[PDB]
Design a protein around this nucleic acid. Structure first.
Ligand SMILES: [K+]
Ligand SMILES: [K+]
Ligand SMILES: [K+]
Ligand SMILES: [K+]
Ligand SMILES: [K+]
Ligand SMILES: [K+]
Ligand SMILES: [K+]
Ligand SMILES: [K+]
Ligand SMILES: [K+]
Ligand SMILES: [K+]
Ligand SMILES: [K+]
Ligand SMILES: [K+]
Ligand SMILES: [Mg+2]
Ligand SMILES: [Mg+2]
Ligand SMILES: [Mg+2]
Ligand SMILES: [Mg+2]
Ligand SMILES: [Mg+2]
Ligand SMILES: [Mg+2]
Ligand SMILES: [Mg+2]
Ligand SMILES: [Mg+2]
Ligand SMILES: [Mg+2]
Ligand SMILES: [Mg+2]
Ligand SMILES: [Mg+2]
Ligand SMILES: [Mg+2]
Ligand SMILES: [Mg+2]
Ligand SMILES: [Mg+2]
Ligand SMILES: [Mg+2]
Ligand SMILES: [Mg+2]
Ligand SMILES: [Mg+2]
Ligand SMILES: [Mg+2]
Ligand SMILES: [Mg+2]
Ligand SMILES: [Mg+2]
Ligand SMILES: [Mg+2]
Ligand SMILES: [Mg+2]
Ligand SMILES: [Mg+2]
Ligand SMILES: [Mg+2]
Ligand SMILES: [Mg+2]
Ligand SMILES: [Mg+2]
Ligand SMILES: [Mg+2]
Ligand SMILES: [Mg+2]
Ligand SMILES: [Mg+2]
Ligand SMILES: [Mg+2]
Ligand SMILES: [Mg+2]
Ligand SMILES: [Mg+2]
Ligand SMILES: [Mg+2]
Ligand SMILES: [Mg+2]
Ligand SMILES: [Mg+2]
Ligand SMILES: [Mg+2]
Ligand SMILES: [Mg+2]
Ligand SMILES: [Mg+2]
Ligand SMILES: [Mg+2]
Ligand SMILES: [Mg+2]
Ligand SMILES: [Mg+2]
Lengths: 191, 97, 80, 140, 166, 148, 95, 20, 107
RNA sequence: CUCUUACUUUUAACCAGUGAAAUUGACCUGCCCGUGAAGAGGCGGGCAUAACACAGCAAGACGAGAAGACCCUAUGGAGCUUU
RNA sequence: CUGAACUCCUCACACCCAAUUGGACCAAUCUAUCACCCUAUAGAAGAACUAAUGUUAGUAUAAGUAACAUGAAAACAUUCUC
RNA sequence: CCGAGCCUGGUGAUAGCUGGUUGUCCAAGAUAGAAUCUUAGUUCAACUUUAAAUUUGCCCACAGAACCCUCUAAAUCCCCUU
RNA sequence: GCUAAACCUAGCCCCAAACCCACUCCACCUUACUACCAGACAACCUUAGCCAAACCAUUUACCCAAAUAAAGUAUAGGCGAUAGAAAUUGAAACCUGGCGCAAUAGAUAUAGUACCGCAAGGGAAAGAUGAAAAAUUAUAACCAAGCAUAAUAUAGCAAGGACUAACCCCUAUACCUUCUGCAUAAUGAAUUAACUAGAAAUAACUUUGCAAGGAGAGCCAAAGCUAAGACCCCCGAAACCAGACGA
């Protein structure tokens, strides 16, 4: 929801074409009294309480809360035997059928999320295999998130990725309250 | 009357298209990326709603300030009138004071 | 035209009820309908009546001459 | 997102099914049927009180008719049967009058006998012992 | 619009068995978009229900209403069609099984009133439906006689039970 | 919403209106309770208890001179120069249990607070920072990124 | 009261309140007595002393005054040598 | 009492001109 | 209401209980989805309840059919020819047991 | 006018063609007395009572029409006059 | 003796006050993930109409009523009447 | 429809005034007053609703609460026990 | 059985991106769309009022060139309603997307046309086969009100209790609104379909996170702080003002 922007919009009685004049006198005609043909009671009139977009849904959970969520997702996967640790993601070939057959033999479920340490250093073989698949998705460590972890039945992390995530997630537990954004220079950050 | 006599065409949704498969990736760009980028910078849309939220009166005030000078005459007129209506509604009308 | 699928499906079910009521289908044997196991039905028949029937005799009791003559005619027609 | 009711047909039929046996336009026009269906259901609820009332009125009329055939008024039969520790209710008494005419005459005779015993007791000054049918069986 | 009445002359029944009774021929005919009122047409359709084809034609030939000529025109072409295309032996051996009028597609026009006011005038159209069945016209129902009432009254007395008891 | 009146129609008067009677918040005489509030100097209190607690946990280093920067970097005090805070005032709360020897620079110091630090062999000085200087000394890195 | 300003879309303070009332951080409001400078020549000393008192407002008045002021006025302040510093916090208050 | 007159309103012509 | 609905007199099937009592429920047909969430309670009923229920009622032939379905249903058929279709959509295992037992006792 | 009458035309009624409007909560739409938001076809007590057209009538349906113009009210308008 | 929704009796129990207020459920729709003869857990919102002399469209009622129209004969040439 | 034309715009003018206000189910729920260009409305009390805290509430025994003046009133206040 | 019903496209909405701008020949400021004659006229100049202040008379927000923050602070004001800065601070920025509409919706739009008005101006309605119509004797039927098939039999808000039995018996003063109180002879409503009305701060509460700290510079803090959830309708005047159009 935080990056949702709804683009639905309707026209109020003030924005519908025309509708300026009073359609007929207040009294004497025997008809119901009306001020504008673009009233919400009229066919073709304005909308009383319709969408008024574009509308933003932005909000931010506390940084510590979002970090804790990543911990829980990793624990749930390990506790339910859906997490597998690899030394590297290098395949013998770039054929996607190999990776598909490997997952079936090892009982990895329908979909698998592959997490590498960095985008630039991803092995070419795994890049070629995953690029041609739909349920086998390769992401860098910085791209890990709860939604992708829950959408995918199996999670595969490389050993460097494991060290990467522990450093980032445990830093939240022992850190001071910020004095200014962490993007700015600190004594012991980054690393 | 008022109800269709045939079934509508079946809805085909590919749950593993590239857009759905990669939803959420980089939502922790800041936490896992040394805070070089804030997740709100991933939001795409109108220049006046990126990483910001408010009620309709606040949205209208924000849009007029940021892109009011670039709006079309008729659109800007409707915006000014909308702000006048909402100003009166929220500040004078309602159940609570 | 309104969005949605549930209302249309619900109405289709009723349109099929009315179609069937206007033109009731010809009755058929319960054996021809789904969920039928003759051997299981035979055993339950005796148990309902609290009677220790012999499954060999009970099955023969239900076989009629007309069913045998017709069963053979079908065999001859199929050259079996 | 614009939402519109898509199953209004079924909502209407929920009311109209109860109005098929009505007269006039209120058997097919919702605006008319809905009001009349509500009234019918309220009547149905309140009728449960009248049903019990009318039934007991019917039994008393039938017991009264049966009692008069034997020269007894209804209060004499009901009053004296209670004094004989006969707890037959009026529903059973009405059924007995129709389908067991000999047993009912016996009950009328019993009530009549107990009634005459009451008169003898009231006329006496306590010298006479209790009537044979006037004795009450005590429980503990 | 609906045009189901014209599709009823296309129903092919299976061959009859030797012992079954001969099935009467049924002919459905209609005329669409007649410039005439269905309310006024109903009276003419009501007149000839149950009549023989020849009696209905005679009654309509001497009626002063405009619908009479149109219905007579429909009855004649239906009679010809029955013998020509529906294997009816005798053209006179036909009777009106059904005859009714229906509402057609109508047009709206303005009718002027005084004081600048107006009304909306409808240019009315109607349909006419007829069903011809082979055979003599069915006899009319004899008036319920006194013997029938007395028998019915005693029947209701005899079906009378003791209510609200055993 | 109720039935009729101003309240069902949403047209009831503003907050504070009392029906025409001179409102409560108007019939009270004006008095200078808050006159000049935005030009009053404020000082964030720093007690000797808090100072000792920070030293015991290693969050403030007593082996080096302590000033506003070191207190802020240790998350001991939160200064808001934009809210007319002019620094920290050293308050005497906790003097009985103060044991650390420190060289500390504050803006205001009470008589008893000065005695506590000096009894233990420390030095205490009162130093003034203007609004601009206070912002820089409290958050040096954001200032260095301006290029001034 | 202005609930949403046209320029900033924010709630505004009624400055009439700031000119007459002092808010203690504990939530209490302090005011002066009406008429404490009016026709003193016809008022007795006991009455005049009562008029010079700084008195508290009740719950209903305090709730109204809180609604008529923004959060800025309810913050904790540390003015140097503030006369009302001691009264900002309550002591030995049960409920 | 001021004279009160309500002039007649003609509906759109097209609504009474449609043909088959 | 009574006037808007049909009625009947109290009766039995073949004077049931006069010479001997014969259970009128003759057949039960379940349709439980393997994966449907609405059929969770129906799957739990087929694992522990249906087998013990059949032991007690040997005169009832129970047909469990596992197939994709959004609304699991049980169809009860009686000796007199009556057919009753009852939904068990999203019902708990205890609720299903009560329903099945009610069907067994009806005529 | 006492005190009205006769005839002709129009309208009218009947046949044929064409075909509006206001109105309409639903109606299986009696009379008397009583009652009641104080004047009852609809409530209480009585009396009356097979069903359905056509032509008249104007006592009732507080009949239709126009959110009373009289009157009062609104911190509602407007025209006019003025020390 | 008759006589209530009072009370008893067999069984069950949250299941008869306007404004207002608290709470428990829920139709359909869209989205996420499921499901796969029509569903589940959630997230959303132009999210529910027996009443506004409401708006638009359809069709009734009044009503086949009010109202409307063509001088005559003839060979359709013509003549006659006004 | 000239006590001052008509059209468009400001304009979704304002209306303490009238009308209208859409799914199911349960629950609590009636009424001292004061001020007000105010009495067709409001704001504060009172009553009412929800949540929370901890401790008495109601019913009431004696003893007790005015002289002046005519009805020497029915009663009230206070109040342990229960 | 008729009248009808049903449909999924036409296009449209909100953003993003990108600055924008036409022309054959002939005619067109006089009575425009009119080949061809003596003229000389020339543009600029404070918005007002409704409304809020419960009247009203000073007053009453209206993009004006950077999101945030300073701050609803300084300050202004029948010091009332309300109005409201600056110094200083300092972020991001990859068009080809949609928890937008789908023929009463979405642009008024099939079109600024038909039609209405002297003029300014106002301003619609609607379509639906199939791969093939060079397959048109073709694509089923079923569903609103209204009718037809099929008028009616004592008695009464039209039902309920029932009953062997439709009615006869018994019980029963439509609904909404408005009121001290309505069967009221008080309001609205022929009927069907569709459309048609509760928007949000201040605090508080509930459930997470972290905790003398909380928060992804600003702010708050004597258990607080951060995040989320959850409350505030629709139609209707006579008027007022500005600029046009009309003898
Ligand atoms: K408001
Ligand atoms: K005469
Ligand atoms: K009359
Ligand atoms: K209520
Ligand atoms: K008022
Ligand atoms: K009214
Ligand atoms: K339109
Ligand atoms: K009403
Ligand atoms: K009345
Ligand atoms: K009345
Ligand atoms: K009236
Ligand atoms: K002129
Ligand atoms: Mg407008
Ligand atoms: Mg208006
Ligand atoms: Mg629109
Ligand atoms: Mg004219
Ligand atoms: Mg109202
Ligand atoms: Mg009121
Ligand atoms: Mg006449
Ligand atoms: Mg005629
Ligand atoms: Mg009377
Ligand atoms: Mg008549
Ligand atoms: Mg009446
Ligand atoms: Mg009248
Ligand atoms: Mg009036
Ligand atoms: Mg005014
Ligand atoms: Mg009783
Ligand atoms: Mg109970
Ligand atoms: Mg559901
Ligand atoms: Mg809605
Ligand atoms: Mg409706
Ligand atoms: Mg309506
Ligand atoms: Mg008439
Ligand atoms: Mg006439
Ligand atoms: Mg004439
Ligand atoms: Mg004029
Ligand atoms: Mg208004
Ligand atoms: Mg209650
Ligand atoms: Mg005054
Ligand atoms: Mg009052
Ligand atoms: Mg006490
Ligand atoms: Mg004002
Ligand atoms: Mg005035
Ligand atoms: Mg600035
Ligand atoms: Mg359109
Ligand atoms: Mg129908
Ligand atoms: Mg009766
Ligand atoms: Mg009154
Ligand atoms: Mg009454
Ligand atoms: Mg009425
Ligand atoms: Mg009125
Ligand atoms: Mg003015
Ligand atoms: Mg002239």
């Amino acid at each position: 929801n935080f990056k949702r922007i709804s683009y639905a919009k309707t026209k109020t009685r003030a924005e519908v074409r025309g509708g300026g004049r009073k359609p007929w006198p207040q009294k004497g005609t025997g008809r119901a009294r009306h001020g504008s043909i673009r009233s919400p009671l009229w066919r073709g009139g304005g909308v009383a309480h319709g969408p008024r977009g574009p509308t933003s849904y932005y909000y931010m959970l506390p940084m510590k809360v979002r970090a804790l969520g990543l911990k829980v997702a990793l624990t749930v996967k390990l506790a339910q035997d859906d997490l597998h640790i690899m030394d590297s993601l290098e395949l013998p070939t770039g054929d996607p059928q190999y990776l598909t057959e490997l997952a079936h033999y090892r009982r990895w479920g329908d979909s698998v999320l592959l997490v590498d340490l960095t985008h630039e250093e991803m092995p070419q073989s795994i890049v070629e295999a995953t690029s041609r698949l739909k349920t086998f998705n390769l992401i860098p460590a910085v791209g890990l998130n709860v939604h992708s972890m829950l959408k995918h039945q199996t999670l595969v992390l490389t050993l460097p990725t494991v060290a990467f995530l522990e450093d980032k997630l445990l830093w939240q537990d022992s850190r001071y309250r910020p004095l200014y954004p962490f993007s700015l220079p600190y004594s012991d950050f980054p690393r | 009357i008022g109800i269709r006599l045939t079934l509508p065409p079946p809805k085909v949704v590919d749950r593993w298209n590239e857009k759905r498969a990669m939803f959420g990736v980089y939502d922790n760009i800041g936490i896992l990326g040394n805070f070089e980028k804030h997740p709100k910078e991933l939001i795409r849309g109108p220049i006046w709603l990126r990483g910001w939220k408010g009620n309709e009166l606040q949205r209208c005030i924000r849009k007029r300030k940021m892109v009011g000078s670039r709006m079309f005459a008729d659109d800007l007129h409707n915006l000014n009138k909308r702000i006048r209506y909402l100003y009166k509604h929220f500040n004078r009308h309602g159940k609570f004071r | 035209v309104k969005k949605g699928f549930r209302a249309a499906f619900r109405f289709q079910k009723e349109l099929e009820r009315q179609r069937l009521l206007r033109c009731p289908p010809p009755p058929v044997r319960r054996s021809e309908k789904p969920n039928w196991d003759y051997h299981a039905e035979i055993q339950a028949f005796g148990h309902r009546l609290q009677e220790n029937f012999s499954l060999d005799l009970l099955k023969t009791a239900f076989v009629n001459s007309c069913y045998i003559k017709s069963e053979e005619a079908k065999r001859q027609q199929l050259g079996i | 997102l614009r939402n519109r009711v898509t199953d209004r047909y079924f909502r209407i039929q929920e009311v109209l099914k109860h109005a098929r046996h009505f007269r006039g336009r209120k058997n097919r026009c919702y605006r008319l049927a809905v009001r009349t269906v509500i009234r019918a259901f309220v009547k149905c609820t309140k009728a449960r009180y009248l049903k019990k009332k009318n039934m007991r009125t019917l039994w008393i009329n039938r017991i009264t008719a049966a009692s008069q055939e034997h020269g007894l008024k209804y209060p004499a039969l009901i009053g004296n049967l209670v004094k004989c520790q006969v707890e037959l209710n009026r529903k059973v008494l009405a059924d007995l009058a129709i389908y067991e005419p000999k047993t009912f005459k016996s009950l009328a005779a019993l009530a009549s006998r107990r009634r005459h015993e009451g008169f003898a007791a009231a006329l006496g000054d306590g010298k006479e012992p209790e009537g044979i049918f006037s004795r009450v069986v005590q429980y503990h | 619009i609906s045009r189901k009445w014209e599709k009823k002359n296309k129903i092919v029944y299976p061959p009859q068995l030797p012992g079954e009774p001969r099935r009467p021929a049924e002919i459905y005919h209609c005329r669409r978009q007649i410039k005439y009122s269905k309310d006024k047409m109903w009276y003419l359709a009501k007149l000839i229900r149950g009549m023989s084809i020849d009696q209905a034609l005679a009654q309509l030939e001497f009626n002063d209403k405009k619908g009479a000529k149109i219905i007579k025109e429909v009855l004649l072409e239906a009679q010809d069609m029955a013998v020509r295309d529906h294997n009816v032996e005798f053209r006179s051996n036909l009777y009106i099984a059904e005859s009714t009028s229906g509402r057609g597609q109508c047009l709206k026009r303005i009718r002027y009133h005084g004081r600048g006011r107006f009304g909306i005038m409808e240019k009315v159209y109607c349909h006419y439906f007829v069903k011809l069945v082979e055979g003599p016209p069915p006899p009319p129902e004899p008036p319920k006689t006194a013997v029938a009432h007395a028998k019915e009254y005693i029947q209701q007395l005899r079906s009378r039970t003791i209510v609200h008891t055993l | 919403r109720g039935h009729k009146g101003e309240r069902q129609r949403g047209t009831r008067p503003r907050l504070g209106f009392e029906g025409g009677q001179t409102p409560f918040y108007i019939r009270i005489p004006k008095y200078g309770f808050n006159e000049g509030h935005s030009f009053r100097r404020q000082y964030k209190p720093l007690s000797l208890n808090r100072l000792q607690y920070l030293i015991d946990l290693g969050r403030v280093d007593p082996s080096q001179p302590i000033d506003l920067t070191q207190l802020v970097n240790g998350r001991g005090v939160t200064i808001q120069p934009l809210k007319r805070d002019y620094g920290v005032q050293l308050v005497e709360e906790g003097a009985d249990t103060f044991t650390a020897k420190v060289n500390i620079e504050v803006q205001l110091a009470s008589e008893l607070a000065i005695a506590a630090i000096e009894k233990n062999g420390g030095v205490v000085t009162t130093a003034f920072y203007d609004p601009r200087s206070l912002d820089i000394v409290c958050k040096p890195v954001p200032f260095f990124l301006r290029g001034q | 009261l202005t609930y949403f300003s046209a320029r900033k879309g924010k709630r505004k303070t009624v400055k009439a309140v700031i000119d007459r009332f002092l808010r203690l951080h504990c939530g209490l409001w302090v005011r002066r007595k009406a008429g404490y400078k009016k026709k003193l020549w016809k008022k007795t000393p006991a009455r005049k002393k009562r008029l010079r008192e700084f008195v508290f407002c009740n719950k209903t008045q305090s709730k109204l005054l809180d609604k008529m002021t923004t959060s800025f006025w309810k913050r904790r302040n540390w003015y140097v040598d503030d006369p009302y510093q001691k009264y900002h916090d309550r002591t030995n208050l049960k409920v | 009492t001021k004279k009160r007159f309500t002039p007649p309103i003609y509906q759109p012509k097209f609504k009474t001109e449609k043909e088959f | 209401t009574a006037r808007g609905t049909p009625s009947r007199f109290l009766a039995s099937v073949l004077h049931n209980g006069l010479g001997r009592y014969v259970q009128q429920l003759q057949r039960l047909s379940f349709s439980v989805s393997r994966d449907g969430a609405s059929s969770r309670g129906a799957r739990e009923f087929v694992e522990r309840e249906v087998i013990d229920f059949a032991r007690r009622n040997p005169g009832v032939v129970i047909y469990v059919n596992s197939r994709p379905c959004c609304v699991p249903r049980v169809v009860a058929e009686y000796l007199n020819g009556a057919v009753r279709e009852e939904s068990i959509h999203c019902k708990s295992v205890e609720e299903i047991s009560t329903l099945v037992q009610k069907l067994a006792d009806q005529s």
